[model samples]
Target chain A: MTIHKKGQAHWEGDIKRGKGTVSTESGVLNQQPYGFNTRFEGEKGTNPEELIGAAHAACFSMALSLMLGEAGFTPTSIDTTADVSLDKVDAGFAITKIALKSEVAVPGIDASTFDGIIQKAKAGCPVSQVLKAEITLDYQLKS
Target chain B: MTIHKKGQAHWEGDIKRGKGTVSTESGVLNQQPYGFNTRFEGEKGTNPEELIGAAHAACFSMALSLMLGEAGFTPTSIDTTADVSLDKVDAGFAITKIALKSEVAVPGIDASTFDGIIQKAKAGCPVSQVLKAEITLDYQLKS
Candidate 1:
C-alpha cells in the first residue's frame, strides 16, 4: 500500500500582473496559465479552488470505490458531484462549504446495506479525511 | 463574466456481489469487466474521482490565477491540496469534509496586500464557492 504523491506549478510576474503554468507527477503539464484571459478578451483561465475541488473529488471517490470493492461488492456506477463555496472573511476569503452528491447502483443490494458500505467508504476515503471543509453528501443507492 | 460549470458521472453494477464500472460524459469509460485496477492499471481506463479532481483543480486554479493577475501582482506558483473525507453517517457513507490548503507566491506584493488578494481569490475561485468547504490557507510571501 504505497501512498504519497507530489505536484508542482510555476508562474512568473506579480500576483495580479503575472502568469504561469502548473504540472503534476501524474503527467499533467502546462496547465492553468496564471494570467488574464487573452482568448476571452478579459477573463480568468483556472485557479487554485478549482484545482482543490478536482483533487478532493477524485481522491475521495477512488478511495470509496476501492473500499466498496473490498467489501465484496462492486459499484455498477458511482456518480459524484462536488460543490465548493467561497466567502469573505475578516482576514480575507474563506471556503465555507463543500457538498458532494452521489448515486450508486448495485443489483441485489438493499438500501440499508448499500448505505452502510458508503458510510464506511466515506470514512476511509483519503481525500475526505485530508480536507478541512464542511463536507456533506447525498448518497442514493439505486436498485 | 460567465462563472458556472457542471459535470456528471454514471455507474452500473450489483451491490451484493460487488461488481460494476463507471463512465462520464467527459469521455471516461471505466469498466470492471476489463479489471478492477483499471484506473491507473490499464491503457484505456478512468475513474470518476480522478476526472473530478482534474476538472475541479484546473477550473479553480484558472479562476484564481486570473483574479491574482488582475489585482496587480503575479504568483510564482500556487499549489492547492484538497482532502476528501468520507465516513459512515445516518443512512450510509457521506463526505464530511473537503479540506483545502493553498500555497501561493507572488513578488512585489506586501503581506497585507497579498493576503487581501488571496482572500478575494478564495471567494472568487469557482471551486471554493461551489464546494462550500471549510477551506484554509497557509499563505506565505517569498521575496
Candidate 2:
C-alpha cells in the first residue's frame, strides 16, 4: 500500500531577510512562520529540524505501541521527545544526530523485554529507518 | 556550530485503539491528534509523513531563495509543495519518495539559471541531504 501526504511552503525575498510559512495538508500546521532567523538566530518560531523531530517522535511512539502489543504487553502510556541536531558540515549544514528520550509506563514487563522491543522500534520505525543521522535512544520503563 | 530543536509525542493504549498527540517545541503543533486510523485509514488528522513533507518543503524553499540571492537574483516569491510517499517495503513501511513541485516568480532570470539553482537547492538543502528516500523536483518560472 502506498500512502501519500502533502505539505507546503511559501517564501518571499532572500534567505536571511526572507519570510516563509509552512503548512501541512491536515491543517494542523497552518502557515506557521519560519526563516533563517527562526532557525539560526534563536528566534522563537517553527523550523524544519523541529518538524523532523516531531515526525520522528510521533512515529517512534506509535511503532513502540505496536511492537509492545505484538509482544503480548500493553503500555499504559508512552511519552517521547526527539531532539534533532543540525550542525555545520564540510558541504554545508547537515542533521548530525537525533536523541530520543522516552518515558514508558507498562505493567508486568521486564526491563530486558522492554529494551528489546524499544530497540526494534527505534531501528524499525519508518521515520527512524529513513533518516541518515545518528539516532540514540534513552528510555525509562515504569511499572 | 550546532542547533538543537525538539518535538514530542504522547501516546496512550495499544496501536489500533490508542490515541496520540504530537507537539513541537515552538508550539506550532500543540497537541495535534494522530493515530493508526489517521495515518492509514484516511482520518483527517496530522501524520508523520505530512510533517516530513512540511520540513522538506520549508527547507527547499529557503535554500532556493538563498542560492538565488547568491546568483545575483531575487525571487519575488517561491511556493513549494512536497508530496511524500509511504510504501510498504520488505521490512515494513518506508518513505520511498518525495516529489517537490515549485512555482517561482523572479524577474530577469533565465530558465537555465533557474533550473540550476533549483536543482542545487533540491540536492544541497539540509533536509534533502538528510533523507534516505528518492527526491524529485518540478518547477515553473514566472517572470
Candidate 3:
C-alpha cells in the first residue's frame, strides 16, 4: 500500500525579503510563517530542517521501541533528540549531517544486549534509511 | 556557517501500541503526539512523512525564487506543494517517491525561460539534493 502525505506552502516575492506560510495535511502546522529570517537568521518561527529533525527523532524512537520489544525487552521509555545540520556548500546549502541522541530505559537488559538491539534499530529506521546525509547515534541505557 | 536544528521526541511501550511526542527546537511543535495510527492509519495526530513534505515544499519555493531572480526574473509568487510517498519495503516501510508541484507568477518571462530556470531549481535546491528518493516536478507559469 502507498501512503501519500502532503505539505503546502505559499511564497510571495523574492528569496531574501519574501514572506511565506507552510501547512501540513494533518493541520498540526496551519499556515505557519517560514522565510529567510525564520530559516536563516534564527528568527522566531518554524523551519524545514527543524521539522525534518522532528520527523527523524519521532520515527527513530518508535523504531527503537519496535526493535527492543521483539527481542523481549519492553522499553519503559525512549527519549531521542535529533540535530539536523544544514550548511553552506559549494552548491548553496546542504544538509551536511545529523546527530541522534537517545536515552532509553528497559527492564533487565544489559548494555551489551541493548546495544545490539539499538544498533539494528538505528540503521533499520525508516527515516534513517531515507536520508543521504551522514547519521550518527549516541544512546545511554538506564538501569 | 552551519545551522544546527534540533528536534526532540519521547516514546513509550512497544512499537505497534507505543505512543510518542515530537517537538522542534523553535517550540512551535511543543510535545505534539505521534504514533502508529498517526503514521500508518488515518489517525488525527501527526506523522514523520507529512513534516518531511512540509520541509520540501517550503524549501523548493524559496529555492525557485532565488533561481528565477538570478536569471533576471523576480517572481511575484510561488506556490508549492510536495506529496511524499511512503510504502512498505523489504526491511520495513520506506519513503519511495515524492512529487513536487509549483505554480509560479513572473512578469516578462515566457514558458520557455521559466521552464529552464525551474529545472535548475528542482535539481539544485538544497532539499532536493538531500533526498534519496525519486522526485518529479510539475510546474506551471502563470499569466
TM-score of 3: 0.97
Cα RMSD to the true fold for all candidates: 7.6, 0.8, 1.2
lDDT string, candidate 2, A60-101, tens digits: 999999999999998899999999999988967899999999
Error of 3 at A139 (Å): 1.2
Higher-TM-score candidate of 1 and 2: 2
Give candidate 3 misplaced runs (Cα > 4 Å). Answer: none
Candidate 1 local Cα displacement, residue B120, angstroms: 16
| Candidate 1 deviant stretches above 4 angstroms | A36-44, B1-143
Cα deviation at A52, candidate 2, in Å, is 0.3
lDDT of 2 by residue, B1-143 (tens): 58999999999998999999999999899999999998988888899999999999999999999899989988899999999999988867899999999999998998987899999999999999999999999999997
**Which candidate should be chosen as best, given DockQ against the real structure?**
2
User: Which lDDT value does model 1 have at B28?
Assistant: 20
TM-scores of chain A, one for each prediction: 0.81, 0.98, 0.95
TM-scores, all models, native as reference: 0.55, 0.99, 0.97
Ranking by DockQ: 2, 3, 1
> Tens digits of per-residue lDDT for model 1 on B1-143?
22221223333443233233333222222222222343333334333333334433444455556666778555667665444333345543344444445666666777777777767765555445555335455555566
| DockQ of all predictions against the true structure, Cα-based | 0.17, 0.94, 0.84
List candidate 2 segments past 4 Å from native. none
